[PDB]
Amino acid sequence: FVREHMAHATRRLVHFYQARIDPPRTANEAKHDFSTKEFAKVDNYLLF
Amino acid sequence: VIPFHRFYSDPGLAATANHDIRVFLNDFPQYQRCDGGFPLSPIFAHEYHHWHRTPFSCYSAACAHTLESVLTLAIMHHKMSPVSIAALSRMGLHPG
Amino acid sequence: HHWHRTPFSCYSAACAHTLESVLTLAIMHHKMSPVSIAALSRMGLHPG
Amino acid sequence: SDEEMVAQKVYYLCLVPAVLNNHACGAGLNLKHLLVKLFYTKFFLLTNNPLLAALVRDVATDENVTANQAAEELFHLVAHVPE
Amino acid sequence: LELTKVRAPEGHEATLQVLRASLTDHQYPELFYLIESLIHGDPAAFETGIELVTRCVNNYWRQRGLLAFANSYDMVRLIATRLGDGAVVPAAYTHYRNLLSITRFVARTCELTGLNGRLCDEPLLAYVSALHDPRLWPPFVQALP
Amino acid sequence: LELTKVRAPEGHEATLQVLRASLTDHQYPELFYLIESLIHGDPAAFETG
Amino acid sequence: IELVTRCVNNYWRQRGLLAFANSYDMVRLIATRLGDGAVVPAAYTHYR
Amino acid sequence: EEERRKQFGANVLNLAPAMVAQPVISTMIPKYMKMGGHEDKLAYQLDLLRMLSIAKKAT
Known about the structure:
Chain A is mainly alpha-helical. Chain A is built from three helices and no strands. The longest helix of chain A has 6 residues, at 28-33. Chain A is elongated, with a radius of gyration of 17 Å. Chain H: Belongs to the herpesviridae small capsomere-interacting protein family.
């Protein structure tokens, strides 16, 4: 959702690591984590 | 350091480039990994808006090199257009 | 109270060379944690 | 670092003992008593030291870098000796 | 291995045979043991004693094909990071770099494919594989982690 | 691949092993990183280089 | 040493078969001695 | 002051006295005067040869 109004990302990029806290990965690497059969099991919370 | 793309972030590489990333991995060694999967900056946080989605990188991080991954990434770059499936099954190439 | 036990040393004494024992000591050092069994069976790698 | 410690543990716990078939034993020199014989060969501004002139000339040698010339570099590296 | 399906290292069999031979040779020298325990894994020691360690490795490889400073990960790591510019050791440096690459590839299989996530204290690989928690220690510490 | 049946490269995987080494190297030297980002892909910039 | 090791190098340079191989004590002394500046460079493969 | 220069060079460091011929061994002796622990006669030896190692270098 953020546009951030890109000016000098080469210096405004390390500021996110100046921040110490990381957002959750938003379902994509979890969709990679859950193996192919467990993606179809009830173990998968991202069935929906 | 510029970890601008999801293909193009590397934990130890970005840490030894700028040690703020080394402080980030001091905090969070869960990404300090070849697969990794960094939260990857509000700038270019647009993973869904990216053309290259997550399983490209999370395939390449465990891909098998030498003439098959080089070409199968380009086969993973087949479009999912309706006309792409059309020409694809038309030439008999099995879609995804 | 040692971390490594007699099966580690007594495998390494009778081991075979050429990266087989090198990688299999690394896989012998998977944990018997419950969360290790959880993540391991969701990898599909066999718990020991 | 974390990758450093993971790599050191992988090396010293998987790669080394599988190579050696546990022909290993972890030793360390008696460096305080050892370097006394290294010290005061003649002066500076050599190579009459027994068992320095043996091993240095026996292995670490060159036509450029002789017994004395190679013992010079180890005389430089005396400084940072740890416990 | 079939979880990984990665092909990073190249000359692994000849590399581990050169390591085996260096750690089989009966008169692997006192001087090499001295310099390795003396440099003690310090890069600020290695960078001061380059022209001894590099010339000594190179003359030892020229003497006999098995390489030098092999038993210490810190010695082979500093030899990896600095040896080679100027071609000090032309060919056995491939075996040195392959020792480093074997450590990296076995660490990848240690880390596997697709165990992300962390508990509030520790990452998940610390819980899953015992190489990744710092609770396990290297048996030869030269700089404390 | 089998719709095409083309075999244009022949030292392909050896070249990719050399590529693996070249883009692996921890001691991949420094003037390389200077010159490549300097030249930035131009024959007019490159003919002086 | 100046006799026996120069004799090993001379005899391997003469004939490709090696030297002092009748005795375990002699082959033990060769395989232990070599490493003193590589007197016998490539036949120490066969001795070790 | 030459008395302590005799004492540390002769009784502690155990050398025949040529203290002033080398400059860097001369400067460590007033520091070794102030330091105790003379029972361990090897530490000053090893503590001085690392300074002699510093005194010539090309790094």
